[PDB]
Every structure is written in structure tokens, then in C-alpha cells.
Nucleic acid binder design. Sequence first.
DNA 1: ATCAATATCCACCTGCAGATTCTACCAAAAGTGTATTTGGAAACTGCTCCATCAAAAGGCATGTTCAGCGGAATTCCGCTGAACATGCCTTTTGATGGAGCAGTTTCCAAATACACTTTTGGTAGAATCTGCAGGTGGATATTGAT
DNA 2: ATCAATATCCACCTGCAGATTCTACCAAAAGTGTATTTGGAAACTGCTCCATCAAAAGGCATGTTCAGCGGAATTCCGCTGAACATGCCTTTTGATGGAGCAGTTTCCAAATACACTTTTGGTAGAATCTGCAGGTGGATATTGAT
Lengths: 108, 107, 127, 125, 95, 89, 120, 107
Amino acid sequence: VTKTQKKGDKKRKKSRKESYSIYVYKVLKQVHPDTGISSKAMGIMNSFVNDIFERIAGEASRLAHYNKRSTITSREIQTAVRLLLPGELAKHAVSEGTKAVTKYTSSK
Amino acid sequence: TKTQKKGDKKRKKSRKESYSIYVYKVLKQVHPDTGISSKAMGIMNSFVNDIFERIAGEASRLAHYNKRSTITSREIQTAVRLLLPGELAKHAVSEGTKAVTKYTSSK
Amino acid sequence: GRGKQGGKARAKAKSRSSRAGLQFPVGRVHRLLRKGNYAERVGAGAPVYLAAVLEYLTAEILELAGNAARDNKKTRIIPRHLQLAIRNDEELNKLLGKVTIAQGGVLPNIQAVLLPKKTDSHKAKAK
Amino acid sequence: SGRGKQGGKARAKAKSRSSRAGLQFPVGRVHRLLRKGNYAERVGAGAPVYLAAVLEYLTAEILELAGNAARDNKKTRIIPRHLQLAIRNDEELNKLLGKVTIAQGGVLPNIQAVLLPKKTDSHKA
Amino acid sequence: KGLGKGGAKRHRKVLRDNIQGITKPAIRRLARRGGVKRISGLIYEETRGVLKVFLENVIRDAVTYTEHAKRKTVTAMDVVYALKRQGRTLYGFGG
Amino acid sequence: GAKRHRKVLRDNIQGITKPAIRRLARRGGVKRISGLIYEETRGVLKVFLENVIRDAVTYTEHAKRKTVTAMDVVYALKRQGRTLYGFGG
Amino acid sequence: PRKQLATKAARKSAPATGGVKKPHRYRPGTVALREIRRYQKSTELLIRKLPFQRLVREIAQDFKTDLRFQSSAVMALQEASEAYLVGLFEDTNLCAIHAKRVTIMPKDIQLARRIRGERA
Amino acid sequence: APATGGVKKPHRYRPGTVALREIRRYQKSTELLIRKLPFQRLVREIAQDFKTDLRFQSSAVMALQEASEAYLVGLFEDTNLCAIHAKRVTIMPKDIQLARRIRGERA
DNA sequence: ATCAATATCCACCTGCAGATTCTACCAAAAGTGTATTTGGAAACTGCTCCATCAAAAGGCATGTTCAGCGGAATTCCGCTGAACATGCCTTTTGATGGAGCAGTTTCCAAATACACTTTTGGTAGAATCTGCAGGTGGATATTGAT
DNA sequence: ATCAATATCCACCTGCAGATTCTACCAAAAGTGTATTTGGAAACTGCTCCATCAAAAGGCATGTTCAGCGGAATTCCGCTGAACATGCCTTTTGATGGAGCAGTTTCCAAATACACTTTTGGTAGAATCTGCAGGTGGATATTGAT
Ligand SMILES: C[As](C)(=O)[O-]
Ligand SMILES: [Cl-]
Ligand SMILES: [Cl-]
Ligand SMILES: [K+]
Ligand SMILES: [K+]
Ligand SMILES: [K+]
Ligand SMILES: [K+]
Ligand SMILES: [K+]
Ligand SMILES: [K+]
Ligand SMILES: [K+]
Ligand SMILES: [Mn+2]
Ligand SMILES: [Mn+2]
Ligand SMILES: [Mn+2]
Ligand SMILES: [Mn+2]
Ligand SMILES: [Mn+2]
Ligand SMILES: [Mn+2]
Ligand SMILES: [Mn+2]
Ligand SMILES: [Mn+2]
Ligand SMILES: [Mn+2]
Ligand SMILES: [Mn+2]
Ligand SMILES: [Mn+2]
Ligand SMILES: [Mn+2]
Ligand SMILES: [Mn+2]
Ligand SMILES: [Mn+2]
Ligand SMILES: [Mn+2]
């Protein structure tokens, strides 16, 4: 008994929407261990990430077309980041992006 | 004769495409006795390239929002309505369905 | 007919542009849509459609630019003509609102308030 | 098939790309979002690693500032207002998001000086 | 257009003049958030007109995405895409 | 440190002369100009060129060239919301 | 024994010789400044919700009949509209002040919209 | 006038009259208003802070000059509207500033 | 009004910078026809969530009164820009080594495709937390009356 | 300068509606491993088209007015804020039918792919040719002084 809930259903479960949420949350606990976030502010963080994602990918896409290149590599992403972000935000993003690629490749 | 001298410099300049001949043909239909300077032709080129990217770009986004894999004349159409000012749109829409119709009705 | 053709008379051909009845290059518009990374696929009508729109906008500017040339007693359209045609057409101007036409200058236009006062010259009505 | 295995060992199984890159953000997802987004015929292996780093970084930058605005308002939970204050009070984030509106974010307190009351008196006011 | 059958349905009631629901106190409050201290009498009508144009333009595009999706329901995403193309990106509703 | 020599000094930005700025203003329909406008215009032009050139040079280095190209500029102008027709693209 | 035994909405002495009450009145601009600090400090939408929704249904309807709306679509429109009006009022305010005025007028809104290219 | 200028001799157009003539002359034409070389020099100097030892295709400088002048002429138009708004006919720095704040080039 | 001065327009002229037109080739498209694959309409349907209807009530809109003080009209003067007379110097025009942009061949490191496994994030719905909204309640600030 | 009057600040208090917390459970990513292809970095280099410079050329730096603009100061009128009475419609809570999103599975009209054939647009010269800039000259509108 109890193995089920009488269901007798006709599929149609969900669809599953992804979001950067658990990741926005991991990064938040790191800079502010005791701070939480409202689902509406998460809503906004989610929009930001999608937004910046498309700006960089887009700029990366154009850069490559302008150069008759058919592949987007870390190097295109890098100059997209320099074209898109201002002053200091760019310096640090570049350095952290470079750092992650180096560590990622020092790996098997 | 036909120079078969490999010394006459076998350079080979990567060729650039442009819409000049087509812009010129159209000019000839609307104003048969009118010319256009090369500078003016550069502007019209810029123009065509720009409208082309604005429309493709919009059609692209349109198909993505709709989880579709192909860009059809339908997307090109919604893009046009989103992009052009009122009458320009009506006419461009009319011109567009017209060329597609003529096209299909002639295999 | 019923019992004709027996040798050579028919081949095969016809450019897409010609079939669509267009001056602009359908084939190329198609190649450009595929090379552009706009979508995985591109239906056959999209390049037709896109091509006609580009042609049509091109004739609209050319037509007006042509007139501006004629108005200045010029036979050859220059950038100034493209700018005069564009900026004087309400819609074209809207579409090209964040575009600058190299060597086009601007529409002659002086704010009312900056004109000299008193009165004006030239027998503006009399005998 | 089933529960799985009495695994959870520690020595030679798979290693996520994020972990490999020292990131919290998901490298595999960014890579997938890149190939599906029609950006280029091809996406190199480093592309998403680098992009995930920049995205994680920027959200780190914004969360740091917003968390502080929360603290300045004596709150524990970041709400949209906090995100706004942090974005508008930072020149770079403000320029990066100059054309963005944060729903429920309001604006920054800011009154043009000529609007402030002139110390009583007569003369002008 | 589907919606409309008569009998069991209809008599939607005519919508008109709703621009007047943007009341003077509402416009005043908006001005305050905008840092405005003093408001001329004609501002209210001017503001309704500018709001109307802003909304026509955004709804016009949002509605075009709806129709294109073959939907009859305008979605938060339709409005969001409309906003993005009009240069007014909005965070908070599915961006 | 060279190329300008004696008789003349003046930084390059001062090469954007009062008469030229005045001409620009005239095309802009401006009838009367206060003295302080000239320096104000130079700083503005300077900001405009930095923003544009910076981006064009970013396109140059990415293409690994030593020469800023018209296309580099045109793409930069497009990025800055200053689309320019007539120079390629 | 409570005969409204309140100390006083005032206090002490007895200079109640005269017959002058004169109710309190804020000077013009004080409540307005007060409202600016109040509204610049909060985020809630300022246009009433139902009326706004009707405005949206009326404009939409004029474009296409039979449309439905998710409620978040309407909320999206309002957050965008109010963010836009507040932004325009800030520019309008700078136009008025530029004019050595403190009162925003239609022409200040027009000037700000022309400069924003909404009128170009 | 004739005054005692170049050994007597009259004629002086009133303040403004030539300004208006200049406006008509310049809105009627298209050439660049800044001298080429100085412009070039400023451009190379600014570029030098981003990457040393660069060369410039002559057309890149030209596009930059074309883009810069169309920008200033346009800015001067808005600046002129801000002066007039304030009942002046003389553009001042606060007018360029106001136009830039409202254009969002801001700060 | 009336002239003197100077800017402006228009009609005509003609050299040459920039079109334009004619071979000649050619490889890079563009078209054709021939499998093979597959997006994405239908069609059918469960299941959100959108539209409506109700009903109560107090937050807030409306309309009014009154008068402070801001906007705008006016006058007036001091100062700051416009106009102007030209020699002087920087820019313009037009050849000329040589830096690189741009062809072109090469060949691997790295991308793609695909078969298979293994790990994870999303979701569901029931708990069970908890910040903090919003309801006080006294400091202490600010404003407006003298 | 007080110093009434009212606004407002800042801490405290504590339910409850959002938030953080699971215990599945799964499909669906995401990571393995192994072939197969290939994008483009690297190297080499020819030939544009840059940077540099001498004469030529023609714009601008300068100093002296003085016209006329901007902005101070003064002055009222009447617009617009503050306050207040009144009462309505928006908000809130909540239930309910059913429109119409949004899964799912069934397919073929249309798209991808390839392979081979046919054509065209781009390039190079080459030799003309041609619109119109810029130069002349006379007339004539415009501006400014009298
Ligand atoms: C919405 As209507 C009444 O204007 O059609
Ligand atoms: Cl199609
Ligand atoms: Cl890579
Ligand atoms: K081929
Ligand atoms: K006053
Ligand atoms: K005043
Ligand atoms: K002076
Ligand atoms: K001066
Ligand atoms: K390898
Ligand atoms: K039901
Ligand atoms: Mn007279
Ligand atoms: Mn399928
Ligand atoms: Mn009432
Ligand atoms: Mn070399
Ligand atoms: Mn898990
Ligand atoms: Mn509270
Ligand atoms: Mn005092
Ligand atoms: Mn709850
Ligand atoms: Mn290859
Ligand atoms: Mn004056
Ligand atoms: Mn149904
Ligand atoms: Mn040919
Ligand atoms: Mn040729
Ligand atoms: Mn001429
Ligand atoms: Mn003459």
C-alpha cells in the first residue's frame, strides 16, 4: 500500500525551466555568508546573467564574423569582454577569465 | 592574344562582393538618365548591408523566442513590421509577398 | 500539343532572382543568411522575401535621391542627395535615425528666433 | 540502475568542467547555451570556461555591493531595491547597465540643490 | 476571431477614455520620484500624451510577437522582448 | 619626442581651432558663441575620439594587425551607436 | 475620573490672553520636498493598478481584438512605464532649472524628448 | 563707418549678420570643417595611448573625421536648442552639458 | 526713401577626375536532380491561469478655497563676443622606400560526431523555518509663528 | 533667536507569507572514450598603400573696436501648493468556468547534403567620354548708412 497516490494520470509533467539560481546563490554565500535573497531579486539576478551572457556571446559572434573565423574561442570572448565592460570591471573579468582557462587546461 | 605570361604578376586579389551592380540596375529602373558617384554608391552599399543585418538579426531572435530552428519568409515578414516605419512596412511587406508568390508560381 | 519535340529545343535554368522577378540577388541573399549564423536553417522563401525588401527600400531612396539630384540640376546622385532625400522623408529618416551619411551635411535650417528683426526686403507685395 | 553503487569513492571518476576551472557557475551549460544560440559554426573548449568566469565574477561584484546596501538598510535579505542602489552607486556597473531598468528598484535619493529651501529670509526667497 | 460567438459569450463593454486613469495625483507622485518640486497645470495632459505614445509603441511590438507566436495571450516575455527592442531592457519578468 | 619644432608648440587638441569649431557650430545652426565654448568642445571631441578609437584599436589587436582600418572604425562606430555609411561594411 | 486630563498639545504658562489660534500651515514647497524624499525612498508603483490595466487593454484592443494578458505582462508594462516617466521627469526637471525655473512645463518635457531623439 | 580704419573707408556688417551668412553657407555644403592634418595628429596621439606604433589607413582617419564632425554638428544643434530654451541666442557650456546629460552621454 | 557697398545669383565655358564601357579570364558561386533526414504542423488533450462576479471598506481621488511666491514682463547697463584688416606659418599637394596587409601552402591540435554512463538541477508538495511588514512608542529634527 | 507643532527617525515586538529546507525521482544534461575531420596559426612574401617630406598654397592668430546681448533688479498678477471635506472605486479575498497555453505523438513537405554542370560578378587593363567644379562677368538682391 501507499506505493502511489491513486494518480491514474495522463503524462504532461512539466517542461523544466533552467536558471542561474543555485549558482547565484552559491556566489552570494561566498561574499555574504549570512545574507539571503528575495525570489524577486533572484529574478533580477537571473535576468542580468542572461543579459550579459547574450551581450558577450553576440559581440563574440560579430567579432568572429568580421574576421572570417568560424569559431568562437576564449580569445573572441576576451575581446568581447574588453569591448563590453568598462574600465576596472574589464580588467578583473579578463584576469579571472584568463585564470580559469589556464587552470582548466592544466587539467586532464 | 591572351597573355599567358606568369611574370605579368599572378597576384590574385581576394574578391569582394558588393551590391553595386544591383543598386545600379535599380537606379536605372527608377531614373534611367541618372548616375551615381562611387561615394554615393558606397553609401547605398552601407545601406543595404545595414537593413539586411537589422532584418536577419530580428528574424533570428524571432525564431529563437519561438524555439524554431529555421528562418522562413514569415520571420522575415514579422521582422519587417517590427523594423520599418508604417508605410515603408506595408509596401515592403507587399513587395515581399509578391516576389515570393511570383517565385513559387514558376517552377 | 500531343506529338511534338524530338531532338533538341529545351535545356533548363532560370535564376532565382529572375523567377522572383527581382533585380537583387536571391542566391546571394541566401548564402549570406546561411553564413550569418541567424538560424540552423533558412527556408527557400526567406531569401526571396528578404531580397525584395532590400530592392524596394533601395528604389525608394534612389527615387527620392534621384529627385534631389534633379532639383539641384544635377544628373549624378551624390551623398548630399542621399542625405537630402533621407532627412526630408519622415519615414526614411526615422529608419536611418542613428546613421550618418558620410559627406552628406545637414538640411538647411535656422531657428526662427535667430533671424534679424525689424522687417524684411524684396517687394513682398505691392506695385 | 537502481540506487547506484557503494561508490562516492575518491580517486579517478569524472570531474565537472566547472570544478576543473575552479568555478561555481556551470561550464557545461554555458557551452550548451553557446552552441544552441547560433553564435558561430563552432565553439572552442575555452570559450564557455572564460564566459562562465566573467559571469560568475560580475554577479560576485553585484552581490557584494547589493549585500552591503542590504546591510546599510539593516536588512538581511537582498531585495530589488538593494540591487538598484548597488548598481546606481557604482560608476562601472551603472554604465554597464545604463539602459536597464530593475523592476521595483526605484531611483536614488537626489534633489537638485536649487530646489532645497533657501534659509528663510526675504530677497529671493 | 474565435472570441465572439454571441449567445453564451459577448458584450465585452466598451473601453474608452482610460488615459484618464492616470490621475493628476499619480502623475504628481511620478514627478516627485523624479525629483520634481513644482508642476505647471498643463503638465498632466502632456504626460498622458507621452505615456500613451510610450505604451502604443511597446504594446504594438509586444502584440506583434504574440501574433507571430500564433498566440492570443500577450505574455510577460512578449512585453520584455518588446521593451528590449525599444531600447528599454527590463529585468524582473523572465529576462 | 619630436615633430612640431620651434615657433610652434600647442598640443594637438589645440589644433582643433576656434575657426573650425566655429564652422562646426555654424553647420549646427548656431549664431553666437561664448568664449568658453571652444575648450568645452575640445574636451567633448576628445572624449568622443577616445571612446571610438579605443574600440577600433581593440578590433585591430584582435585581428593582430598594426594598422587601424576603416572597417575597424566603422565597427567601432556601430558599437557606439554611431553607424556611419560610406566606408565599407 | 478621566475628564480628558491630557497635559497639553502645548504646555506651561497662561498667555491665553488674546483670541489667536491660527492653525498651522506648511509653506509652499515644503510638503512637495517632503514628497520627493518620501517617494525617492520607496519602490512601489505609483499609478493605481486597475486603471493602468484598463489603459493597457484599451490601447492593445485598438491594435488587435480579442487579446488576453498574463497579469505579469501588465505588471511588466507598468514597471516599464513608470520607470520611463520618472526618467523623463528627471530630464524635464533639468530643462526647467536650466531655464532658471523651478516649475516643470510642457516645453521642458518637449525639449527633453527632442534631445533624447524621441523627437530628434 | 567709414570710421578711420584702413585710412577711413566705411562698411561694417552688424554683429550677427555674417554669422547668419556663415550658417547658410555651411548648411548648404558638405566638406569637412576641421583641417585634415591637425585632426590626423589628434587621432594618432589618442590611439598611441591604447597601442603604440600603429599605422592608419587614410580611409580610417577620414571615417573618424566624418563621424566626429557629424557628431559635433549634431551636438551643436541640441546645444543651440538648450540656449534658446533659456531665452539666449548664445550657446554656453552649460548648454553643451545639459544636452550631453539628456543624451545620456551623461554624468 | 534713397543710394553705396558688397554679397549673391545665374548663364556660359571647358579641362580633367572620375565615371563608364569593352575585352578575357576565371573561380567562385549559383543552379540542377537525387537521396536522406527532419523540423514543426496537425491532432488530441491535461491543466494552468485568465476573465469575471461578488462584496465589503478605507485609502485615496476629486473639487474647492485661499494666498504665497514663482513666472514673466520691463528697464537698463556693463561686458563680452562679432566683425574686420592681412602677414605669417601651418597645412596642403604630390612623389617615393618600405612596412605590413593580404595571398597561399602546410599540417596538427583541437572541434565535431556519436555510443555509452554517470551526475545533477529542477520540481513537487509538505514541513517548518524565519525576516521583517507594519503596528507602536518615545526621542530629536524640522519648520513656521513671532 | 526661541520654541510650539508636527513630522520623522530609529528601536522594539511578533505573527505569517515568503524563504530555506528536504526526500524523492527522473530525464536530461553532462562527462567518457574513440574515431574523423579540419579550422586557422605559422611561415613566407609580393605588392599595395602608408608615413615622410620638399615646395606650393592659402587659413588663421591677433588686436581694436563697439553693437547688442545677457542677466541683475524691480514688480505685480494669478497660478499652483497646502489643506480639507466628502465619498467612491480600487484593492482584497476568493471562488469558478473554461479559454488556450503548452505537453505529446504522428508524419511528410521542405530542408540539408552532395555531386556535377553552367554561369556570373569581380578583377585587370585599356581606351575613351563626360558631368560638373570652379572660373569669368555682368545683374541685382541685401545690407547698412544717411
Ligand atoms: C479600444 As477602442 C474602444 O479604442 O477600440
Ligand atoms: Cl521560407
Ligand atoms: Cl577556446
Ligand atoms: K561551389
Ligand atoms: K519671490
Ligand atoms: K522670482
Ligand atoms: K574679449
Ligand atoms: K572674440
Ligand atoms: K591532439
Ligand atoms: K476548473
Ligand atoms: Mn525704408
Ligand atoms: Mn522531429
Ligand atoms: Mn468624490
Ligand atoms: Mn615585410
Ligand atoms: Mn541533486
Ligand atoms: Mn517597519
Ligand atoms: Mn532667524
Ligand atoms: Mn506560505
Ligand atoms: Mn583547411
Ligand atoms: Mn536682452
Ligand atoms: Mn479549449
Ligand atoms: Mn559578366
Ligand atoms: Mn577595372
Ligand atoms: Mn558652380
Ligand atoms: Mn564677378
